[PDB]
Amino acid sequence: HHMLENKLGIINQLELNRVEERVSKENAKRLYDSGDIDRIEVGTFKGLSYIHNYLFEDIYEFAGKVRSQNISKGNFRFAPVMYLEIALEHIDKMPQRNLDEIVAKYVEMNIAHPFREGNGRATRIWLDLILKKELKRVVDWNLINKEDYLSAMERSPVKDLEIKYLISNALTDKINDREIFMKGIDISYYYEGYTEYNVDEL
Amino acid sequence: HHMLENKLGIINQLELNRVEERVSKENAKRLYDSGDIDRIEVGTFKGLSYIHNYLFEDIYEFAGKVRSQNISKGNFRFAPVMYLEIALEHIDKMPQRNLDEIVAKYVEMNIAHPFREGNGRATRIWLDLILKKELKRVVDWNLINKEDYLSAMERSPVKDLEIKYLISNALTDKINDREIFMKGIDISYYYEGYTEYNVDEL
Amino acid sequence: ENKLGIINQLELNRVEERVSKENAKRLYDSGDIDRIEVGTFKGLSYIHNYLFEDIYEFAGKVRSQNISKGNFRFAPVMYLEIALEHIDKMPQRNLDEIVAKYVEMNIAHPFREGNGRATRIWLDLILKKELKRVVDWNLINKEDYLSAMERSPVKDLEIKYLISNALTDKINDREIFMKGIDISYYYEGYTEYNVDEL
Amino acid sequence: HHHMLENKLGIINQLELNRVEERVSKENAKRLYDSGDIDRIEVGTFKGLSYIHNYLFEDIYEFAGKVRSQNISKGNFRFAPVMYLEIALEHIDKMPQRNLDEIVAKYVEMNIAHPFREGNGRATRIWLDLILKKELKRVVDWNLINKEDYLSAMERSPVKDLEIKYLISNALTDKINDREIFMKGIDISYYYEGYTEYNVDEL
Amino acid sequence: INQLELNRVEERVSKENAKRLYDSGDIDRIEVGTFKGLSYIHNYLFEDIYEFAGKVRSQNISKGNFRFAPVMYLEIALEHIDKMPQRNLDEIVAKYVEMNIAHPFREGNGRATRIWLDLILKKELKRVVDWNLINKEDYLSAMERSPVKDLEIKYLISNALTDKINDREIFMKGIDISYYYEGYTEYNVDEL
Amino acid sequence: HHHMLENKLGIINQLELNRVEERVSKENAKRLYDSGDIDRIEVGTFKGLSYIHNYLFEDIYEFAGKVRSQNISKGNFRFAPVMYLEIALEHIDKMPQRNLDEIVAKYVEMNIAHPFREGNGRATRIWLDLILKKELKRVVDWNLINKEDYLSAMERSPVKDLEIKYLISNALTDKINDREIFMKGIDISYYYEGYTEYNVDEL
Ligand SMILES: Nc1ncnc2c1ncn2[C@@H]1O[C@H](COP(=O)(O)OP(=O)(O)O)[C@@H](O)[C@H]1O
Ligand SMILES: Nc1ncnc2c1ncn2[C@@H]1O[C@H](COP(=O)(O)OP(=O)(O)O)[C@@H](O)[C@H]1O
Ligand SMILES: Nc1ncnc2c1ncn2[C@@H]1O[C@H](COP(=O)(O)OP(=O)(O)O)[C@@H](O)[C@H]1O
Ligand SMILES: Nc1ncnc2c1ncn2[C@@H]1O[C@H](COP(=O)(O)OP(=O)(O)O)[C@@H](O)[C@H]1O
Ligand SMILES: Nc1ncnc2c1ncn2[C@@H]1O[C@H](COP(=O)(O)OP(=O)(O)O)[C@@H](O)[C@H]1O
Ligand SMILES: Nc1ncnc2c1ncn2[C@@H]1O[C@H](COP(=O)(O)OP(=O)(O)O)[C@@H](O)[C@H]1O
């Protein structure tokens, strides 16, 4: 699964964590600066798969591809592989006209959790693209506290009020401001326990 | 709670996470290199409080003192504040003769969760000292996968088999090896989302 | 979110009660209630639309969003259709099977709202056809009922006991029906009107 | 015996009992405010909460104003055990209430304590408003908090109080002596609990 | 050593103790509805088998997803239970449900506390439980549910109550069914 | 209907029914091994598992070897919905089984599927052992897995299978054609499920 392990000779979890952060943040920076981010299908699993492969190819085996194993976090079982493809088609047809509908679509894509790893970071980029297109807003992720965010996502399959509230109060109209995107990548990786680098210095 | 946030006027989450890592890891290196770690009471809340205050004095308000608020993680509500002092009295009297008793005592101290923050890093140092005294072993924490460790702790209030096997298989006889300690500190902080520095380079 | 354009929650509660109870009275007194298919989603959909089409755009139609209550996630939309086909084929010969079928219909929770009130009407029509009984709903305490439904996806013992001990043979008694409407609405927090007096 | 109006004239079913309990205690809530009695209650203590509960439910609930002697639950949640209830209320009495974070934590602990057999919801929200009024010069406009949002947030709150804090924070108003805020808040608060027949204004 | 063999020995030895408890008349002489009475029952059944039989555990225990009363409150919880009323079925079942949450022994709480429950019902309602009339999986599910709502277990108990409160065969067959609930099926207690 | 012997023989006592169902199905398990029939079963497929289930239970359970038609639960866990059993079982048939990680994940999914009304635990463990024998040249020495450890690990396994994987891994033996391991394993397996009356050897 961790393609860099055998290639760089890493036998330490923290060292592997840092290298995967560096390489994927390099790809994340290029995604934005190349303008490739603007030519991705918005709000579909085809767009999400592209983001995920863009971030993690040469890092995760099968980056951009659905997982073949069932996974969980805390006590929550994500969508079973057996109807994973069915779930993703449903999400593709969900509406995205207002914040209520966009947050619900994001919550369902987190529940699907289609990749083995990288779901959190890749789906937040995907979410920002839906908000930018439909609401002319993106998230200022530093205004969402890490533990508040993770608690809200844990709560969200049952009730999405917490994550909707957090997102709503962090929306900004500066949808073409490069620094907001870049600051948000560092915060987004921080949520997942990657704190070594700043995307802008790579 | 976060003293550096209010003192230095930090307003970026990631910056606060990094400086809180730097200063507490600087203290962690001193704790070991000064020999102060070898003079602590072993297996008591007094000894755990000393460790917690050593790491987090001037970082967390009331470091080394029991919290006055109720806290939770995921879906789990930790020991009520009303009953914390008597819960710690019970843990002090728990036996620690073998791996079973030691792990059960560790699991109860995690359930007590006596500090507002920092329970994970502080209690793992405390655990290593119990294992050292009673079994002449310490944990090689890099041998315990981060996600395996965190899921095992979430499980442990119901059944501690998972954490016990993870600890058992990671034990090493190198109880006075500085490299094992320092690498364990870095892995331990990595479990909790701090990856910026290496402790022995501070 | 509604045809009446009401955006005050307490006002919506009261007008929904009066309007849907008005429709419920007509369902019964018109005899329309006796011409519903018994024990199928078609018939539940007919009841739900009868009650709610004045108010809610979706009346009688399967939801397209996912919903939950308490800590329970109801049947996912992606297999709502197949879930309802399965329920349509479940047996209803005795009380054990009728309660099982009711419990699965609640798990499906097919409408955006109104599932509780519409499906209890639907249940009474199954009991009436197969056991010549209906529920005397005031004999079921509100909090016992709600907690029994919360338990029922795991085990249906609680709700089965409550229904069994409240069955009555007065299956054509208009006051048993009307008071059952009022108690059923009371379960869901609507208490202003008596359907009888509308 | 808990419902002391159980056997009165015309009280023949659960709905009729619900309605008379709504009318009598809302009549009490109106007098509580319009008499000025509400302004004399000790703020932020269990002594204050029991005065409110007794004011609303005296002669409706047996033992109104008194701590329950039975354990109770709601949904999947077990409230504080009776065996240490009085000590739990003493600890709540000492909790700070200087800012919104602290006030909401104190409210959440009082709801976990759930000290009465019934009527905890409605009595404790009035109590909450008086704390907010004294300490922040704000009260909750309960009409800006949806019923199902509110109930779910309370179910969430023993684990994390973020949901209910957001709902309270966005509904705060500085109209702390506005009669309609209070009166409509009483009607909304009762509607949260399944009582909808009357407007407190009109009793 | 074989797990099954230990299980069979424990059944045989403790079921013998249950028969003596009833046949000797000792069961009629114990305090009804208190932890002291329950402790006497547990020691009587398991004296030879469990270390610290009849004594409150010193470890925290769980079953399924349920964490039983933590040891530090165990004494105060048993004290509360001792004071709980037992005048009707609602109160008895609540008292029984609280004693199961307490779970005061390391093992054998189920079998000892059901004997204890029958004695409360005998004294206060002049009824005991015909345990064969409560299906095993119905019972265990109802007990899992009981800390949240006791309606399930109350209905099962109510429909199984019999007025044959001094009938030796009701008690002995109840003992067999009670052990069956917990996975001991080898012996019939009256054939010991 | 489900318990075929209950009405045919008028067995009214739950313990007596438990013991006769143990005796009949354990007689069948003994014959499954001693006849060589076990060695012709397809390995790792629902067809093979259905063969085992019917072989043990066809005189005891109305639809032995056949998928259930109702939904079922155990503890707080709701097993795979009936509407999905077919797709679940088709997916499980395609899962790899080359190493212990993959075999355990496959066993965990077959338990979640829980395809029969009753008898899933005992039948699926025989099925598991035949996969391990084929792919790893090991079987489980079940007496080395404590009953409550096993039941707790299975309760845990839909979330994380590490607990059950450790128990299994540490109980593997290379004595894959040892009759005592198989027979004692049958007695322990039945003991896990609350059947302790007979020794399968002596039937
Ligand atoms: N208990 C939970 N239930 C549901 N979703 C969760 C839970 N905990 C975290 N999440 C969501 O899962 C995401 C993590 O997915 P993962 O594939 O691990 O991403 P990454 O590789 O980016 O860390 C989090 O960012 C959060 O959105
Ligand atoms: N759901 C859970 N239930 C119980 N314990 C947990 C859970 N999740 C994590 N833990 C334990 O709590 C620790 C974190 O406690 P915390 O006070 O946040 O420490 P730190 O400041 O070092 O991160 C983890 O290392 C783990 O041991
Ligand atoms: N936690 C729960 N789990 C499953 N079912 C529930 C739960 N709580 C309530 N129910 C059932 O759901 C019904 C409410 O559904 P809803 O669509 O809100 O109907 P209504 O609009 O009539 O109130 C209740 O009447 C009860 O039958
Ligand atoms: N599942 C739950 N867990 C914790 N608290 C809850 C839950 N559901 C509701 N609550 C809180 O409990 C209150 C109900 O208490 P109760 O004594 O019934 O008051 P009332 O008589 O006013 O209805 C609700 O207003 C809400 O604050
Ligand atoms: N998940 C659960 N939650 C609470 N109580 C339970 C649960 N499962 C079983 N019980 C109760 O616990 C009893 C088992 O207790 P235990 O100490 O193992 O007794 P025994 O040694 O007699 O088997 C059961 O008879 C039942 O009453
Ligand atoms: N809470 C649970 N969640 C998931 N699986 C469980 C749970 N409890 C037990 N199991 C699994 O289910 C099996 C029992 O299924 P069952 O069909 O009753 O088999 P049997 O008839 O052999 O007793 C157990 O052996 C265990 O593998």
Numbering used by the authors:
A (entry chain A), B (entry chain D): 6 to 207
C (entry chain E): 10 to 207
D (entry chain F), F (entry chain C): 5 to 207
E (entry chain B): 16 to 207
Show passages lifted from the paper.
The most frequent PTM reaction catalyzed by FIC enzymes is the addition of AMP using ATP as a cofactor, coined AMPylation or adenylylation. Enterococcus faecalis FIC belongs to class III FIC proteins, which are comprised of a single FIC domain and carry an autoinhibitory glutamate in their C-terminal α-helix. We discover that EfFIC has both AMPylation and deAMPylation activities borne by the same active site. Furthermore, the conserved glutamate implements a Ca2+-controlled metal switch that tunes the balance between these activities without conformational change.
We determined crystal structures of unbound, phosphate-bound, AMP-bound, and ATPγS-bound wild-type EfFIC (EfFICWT) and of unbound and sulfate-bound EfFIC carrying a mutation of the catalytic histidine into an alanine (EfFICH111A). Two crystal structures were obtained by co-crystallization with a non-hydrolyzable ATP analog (ATPγS), for which well-defined electron density was observed for the ADP moiety. E190 has the same conformation as in other glutamate-bearing FIC protein structures and is stabilized by a salt bridge with Arg122 and, when present, by interactions with the nucleotide cofactor. Based on the observations that the α- and β-phosphates of ATP bind with canonical positions to wild-type EfFIC and that AMPylation is potentiated by mutation of the conserved glutamate in various FIC proteins, we propose that the primary role of this glutamate in AMPylation is to mitigate the efficiency of this reaction in the presence of Mg2+, rather than to fully repress it, possibly in order to match AMPylation and deAMPylation efficiencies.
